[PDB]
Amino acid sequence: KWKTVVAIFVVVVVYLVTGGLVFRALEQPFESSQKNTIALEKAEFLRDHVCVSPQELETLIQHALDADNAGVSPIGSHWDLGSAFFFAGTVITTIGYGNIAPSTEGGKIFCILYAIFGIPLFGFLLAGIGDQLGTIFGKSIARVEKVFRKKQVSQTKIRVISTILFILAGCIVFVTIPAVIFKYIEGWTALESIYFVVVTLTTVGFGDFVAGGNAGINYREWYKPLVWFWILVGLAYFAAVLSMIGDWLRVLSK
Amino acid sequence: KWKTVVAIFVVVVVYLVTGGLVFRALEQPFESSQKNTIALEKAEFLRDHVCVSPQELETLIQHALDADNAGVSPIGNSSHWDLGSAFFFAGTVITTIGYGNIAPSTEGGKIFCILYAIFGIPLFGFLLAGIGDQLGTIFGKSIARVEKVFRKIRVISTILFILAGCIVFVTIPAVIFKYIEGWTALESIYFVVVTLTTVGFGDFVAGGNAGINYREWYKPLVWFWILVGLAYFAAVLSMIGDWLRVLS
Numbered sequence A: 001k002w003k004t005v006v007a008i009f010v011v012v013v014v015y016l017v018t019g020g021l022v023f024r025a026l027e028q029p030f031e032s033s034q035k036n037t038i039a040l041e042k043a044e045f046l047r048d049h050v051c052v053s054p055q056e057l058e059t060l061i062q063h064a065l066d067a068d069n070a071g072v073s074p075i076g077s078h079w080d081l082g083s084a085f086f087f088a089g090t091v092i093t094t095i096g097y098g099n100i101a102p103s104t105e106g107g108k109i110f111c112i113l114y115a116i117f118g119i120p121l122f123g124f125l126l127a128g129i130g131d132q133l134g135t136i137f138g139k140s141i142a143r144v145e146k147v148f149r150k151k152q153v154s155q156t157k158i159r160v161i162s163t164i165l166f167i168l169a170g171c172i173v174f175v176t177i178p179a180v181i182f183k184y185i186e187g188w189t190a191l192e193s194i195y196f197v198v199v200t201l202t203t204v205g206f207g208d209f210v211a212g213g214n215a216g217i218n219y220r221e222w223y224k225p226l227v228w229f230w231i232l233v234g235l236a237y238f239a240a241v242l243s244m245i246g247d248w249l250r251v252l253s254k
Numbered sequence B: 001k002w003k004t005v006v007a008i009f010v011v012v013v014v015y016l017v018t019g020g021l022v023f024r025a026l027e028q029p030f031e032s033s034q035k036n037t038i039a040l041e042k043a044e045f046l047r048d049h050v051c052v053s054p055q056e057l058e059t060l061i062q063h064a065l066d067a068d069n070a071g072v073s074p075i076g077n078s079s080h081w082d083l084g085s086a087f088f089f090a091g092t093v094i095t096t097i098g099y100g101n102i103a104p105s106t107e108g109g110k111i112f113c114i115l116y117a118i119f120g121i122p123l124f125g126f127l128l129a130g131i132g133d134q135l136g137t138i139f140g141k142s143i144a145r146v147e148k149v150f151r152k153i154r155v156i157s158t159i160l161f162i163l164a165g166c167i168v169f170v171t172i173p174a175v176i177f178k179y180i181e182g183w184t185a186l187e188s189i190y191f192v193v194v195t196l197t198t199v200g201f202g203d204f205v206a207g208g209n210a211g212i213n214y215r216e217w218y219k220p221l222v223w224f225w226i227l228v229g230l231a232y233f234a235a236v237l238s239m240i241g242d243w244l245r246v247l248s
């Protein structure tokens, strides 16, 4: 119904206006801070180095940015058999970190066709893992559900206890335990690790934090595909969690 | 069934190995080219400018990168967190596109983004399902008018919907982004596909240029296109999924 479509639209538009105001309240002071810091650092380089013109400076910065955009650090491979495999995975899962992206015209063309047919192909694997996890957790939850049924507990509370039991159990295995590993391996903060997990498993994938992206960290070859395996089982868990939040939002709608 | 789950896994693993080899065949020679280009550009700067030491060169390059990571161009008044630009950022999280050209740098901004995504993505799901049902009624009533003419079929209707929607949601907006943002014909189509599949690399982001001073009607209209375009692409990717299930 169009009447209900307009209602959800008004809620979403308000939710975005609200979100945007909270984000600028938390981010605009830091943005202004970095805007002034680069203004000062560029101005002090032209003071200290008189043999450098303001135009020659901008040309160098542009050359450094062009290199960084291409996935090459302008300080001091991303397409190796393993790193390219994980890139492909990032496209198929719709995460799209963008820390690396195709620069070649042909690379962009192949990326279009690869995503179009690859994303539905993953959909089957994600639905398959989703059904398997629903059988593993489903059998474990039923064992607990039978215990409360004997205790004359209401059908309401049992379903509530089960929903909190599944979320809490999976949150340990797919969110907490991997974030502890990323905090130690990648060397991020407790917040930045949880932030990476949520941003990854929601398929948002900003690319500010990417597992196995540090030049200084020389971790073994098994880490990159193991991260992709965590993603595979973690996306199925998060899909169920986001579906339950949707289900609870439908309850609040009625 | 687990027997079919392992089968799809083997297909996906092969598809990734294949994909990775095609991507490196197209990208690794250019990567090596840019690796040598920055090496020579830095070496030429230190030759032409003797008053600059190799240490103070890396320090500025580092300062420039730090600024770019924070979403501030180290080139050359404009903001990324203004009422309108922050609204589009919120939209990017909710649609799961996540361009990442801008992302929260604050610990609090990161905390709020976790909660915002968790409750916001399902909220969008309803709006996307609602637009999906409405488009299915608009395109469904228009296809039935043509279907009645030939009766006096399902394959002919699928080709008609894909071609019609591809003009309205992919072709026409790509032409606008090529003129407004100033991208190539390829880069505009590439941006549209990367955006409407919710991949969102962030290499190309509408309303991201510092030099381009587009009005307050540009940034929200882009999200309005994202809103109706995601519903179209969701149906297209569902049909490709349906077609693959037939081949299975």
Ligand SMILES: [K+]
Pocket: A096, A097, A098, A099, A205, A206, A207, B098, B099, B100, B101, B200, B201, B202
């Ligand atoms: K990104």
Ligand SMILES: [K+]
Pocket: A094, A095, A096, A203, A204, A205, B096, B097, B098, B099, B198, B199, B200
């Ligand atoms: K994404």
Ligand SMILES: [K+]
Pocket: A095, A096, A097, A098, A203, A204, A205, A206, A207, B096, B097, B098, B099, B100, B198, B199, B200, B201, B202
């Ligand atoms: K992304």
Ligand SMILES: [K+]
Pocket: A093, A094, A095, A202, A203, A204, B095, B096, B097, B197, B198, B199
């Ligand atoms: K996505």
